[PDB]
Each structure stands twice: as structure tokens, then as C-alpha cells.
Structure 1
Amino acid sequence: KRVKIAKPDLSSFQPGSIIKIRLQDFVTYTLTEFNLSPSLNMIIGPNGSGKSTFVCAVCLGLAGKPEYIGRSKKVEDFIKNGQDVSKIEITLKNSPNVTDIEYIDARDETIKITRIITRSKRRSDYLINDYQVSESVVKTLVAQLNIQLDNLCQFLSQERVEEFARLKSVKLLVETIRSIDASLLDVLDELRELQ
């Protein structure tokens, strides 16, 4: 009979994972589809062949901006040369622990985020369930998912790799105190000054 692709069932995949990614109108890849394993993802390609561009587009899709990843901002690179719009779509598991969502119920297990980049228009516009929304809603959705772009632990880039290469003990203390609540250290320091 007709060949059928594997069902992208979000229930089987762990919450917060991505099953299928659609990349439309990008450098050397006008239409591409990508699948990610639930346990770990391995991508093999030379640098500058668009694999790094694909990863950067995926990062930009989840409320990501090039200047917020500690790297140079090149919006034009993502856009296909001669195509007006470049589209990146990310599908994620949805659980009833995140607020400020559009067209998606709490019981629904799918949160689809689409980023379109065009040269003519300069604004941050994202799509939830193919409905236009401001970047603030996606950014707060990412913040409520306990995933941070600015923090070096969740996302690591070449500049972040260089920063981590020379790391002082004070930086490790700051990271440890920021991962846990930092109020306790401040209270202990105030008590030490009182002593």
C-alpha cells in the first residue's frame, strides 16, 4: 500500500521535546524536514553548509533573537536570497503548567511556534497555531518553560564556550547561587555584616 511516515505522537515524546521541524526558504534548503530523537540528537555536516544556520533558526523560532545568543546578528543570512519570507516551525509537547497561550487549551499537548523573517518588514512577529502574535507572548512562554536563552548553561555558543574556557571560582559561585534562590546568600551576608 502507500508508504506512511511515522506518527509524530507528542505523548510518547518527553515534555519539552521537538519531533518534526519544517525549514522553508533558507540558504541551500528551500524546503527541508528534520526529525529529532527523544533521547539525543546527532547532526553531521561541515560548518557554513546551513546546519549551523538551521540550528540558529531553530533557536530564533523559540522567541530567539540573534543578539540575545551572544553572537553577531545577521537576519539576512536566514532569509533565502531572492525569497521575500523565510519560515521556521517548531512543535513542542504542551502541559497545563504554562499560561498566556493562544488557540491552545491546557489539555492540548501541542504548542506550535512559527517564525517568519522578511527583509521589507522590520518587527518581531511570531505565530502560534498559524495566528500572528507579538514576541513578548513567545518570550514569556519560553520563560514559563524554565528554558533561558541569555543564561550560558541552557545554550552554549562559541563566545559562551570562550567565556566558559576561562572561568573564575567567583563565576562558579555566582552560577551556583543564581541556579538556586540567591536570597539565602544575601540574608547570610547581611547576618555576617551584623555579626
Structure 2
Amino acid sequence: VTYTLTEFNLSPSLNMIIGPNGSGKSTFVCAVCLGLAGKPEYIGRSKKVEDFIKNGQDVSKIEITLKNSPNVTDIEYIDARDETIKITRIITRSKRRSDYLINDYQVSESVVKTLVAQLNIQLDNLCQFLSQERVEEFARLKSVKLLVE
């Protein structure tokens, strides 16, 4: 939406994005989240796949590159000594399936999901990812929930 060709650079220490809500910045962040084996209903928010897809364009594409270390298994085309993991998510209207890309190779969502699991990063858990519904849930937080976490 309003961004058909965009590139973003992210600081190694910490990142800041400035922009009004609804201008695509939240859309871009959600696209980045969905790229790494993410689904709209697994982030504690409403699912709108058509919002990501550009109105008129068939396919919307997000690419995310991460550092690679020899501590994660079930990878395609990428060696352990390699330092690059490229994960691509595409959303299209005609096709309804979970197909991701690892270094530009088509895979099921299971492979990317188990990779995300093996990177010690979690999407459903509220500690790693914080959303508006999750902010509200933390707002009224009981000691039992603290013990549980």
C-alpha cells in the first residue's frame, strides 16, 4: 500500500521509524513479522491478507535477511558456515496456501516455523513480540501471570 518499491536499512544497535499510523509503517512492520514464519492470527490481531497486497498487483513480496550461524538445522541451499539467511513471504489473491522462500527457494511454512523456533524467537509468546492487544493484556496483569511467565 502506497509503497511498491521500497528499501529499508536497520541499525545494528536499535531502530527507530517515524510516521503516522495507517501510513504503511505499521503495515511494513507487520509484513516484516509475517515474513519470518508469521501469520496475522498468530500475532494477536485481526487477519487481513488483502491489505498487504497492493490494490491491482497480484503478488506482494517481503524479503528479510538475517545473520546465519551453525546452530540451526533444516535449512535449504544455505551452508552452516554461511552467514546469510534470506526469508521471503509473498501474498497473492488467487492462491491460498502457506508458501515461503529460503534464500529464494520455495518451502512450506513448517520449515520457516521450525527455523524461527530454532532461533529462540517466538511469535505467539507476548514477551518477544508486543502488539496493541498484547499491550492491553499487559496493562491489567496479575501476579499469577508473572509467576506463569
TM-score normalised by the chain length of structure 1: 0.76
The 5 A counterparts of 1:58-97 are 58-97=32-71
CA shift, 1:129, in A, is 1.2
Distance 2:51 2:110 in 1: 24
Question: SS of 1:67's equivalent?
Answer: helix
Aligned residues: 149
Deviations 1:102-146 (A, max 9, x none): 000000000000001000000000001111100000000000000
Distance 1:129 1:95 in 2: 15
Distance 2:64 2:103 in 1: 11
State which of 119, 131, 137 in structure 1 corresponds to 2:93. Answer: 119
TM-score normalised by the chain length of structure 2: 0.99
Identity among equivalent positions (%) equals 99
Deviations 1:62-103 (A, max 9, x none): 000000000000000000000000000000000000000000
Deviations 1:14-59 (A, max 9, x none): xxxxxxxxxxxxx000000000000000000000000000000000
Unpaired segments ≥5 residues, structure 2? none
Distance 1:113 1:28 in 2: 23
Deviations 1:153-181 (A, max 9, x none): 0000000000000000000000xxxxxxx
Question: SS of 1:77's equivalent?
Answer: helix
Taking only aligned residues, the RMSD between alpha carbons, in angstroms, comes to 2.2
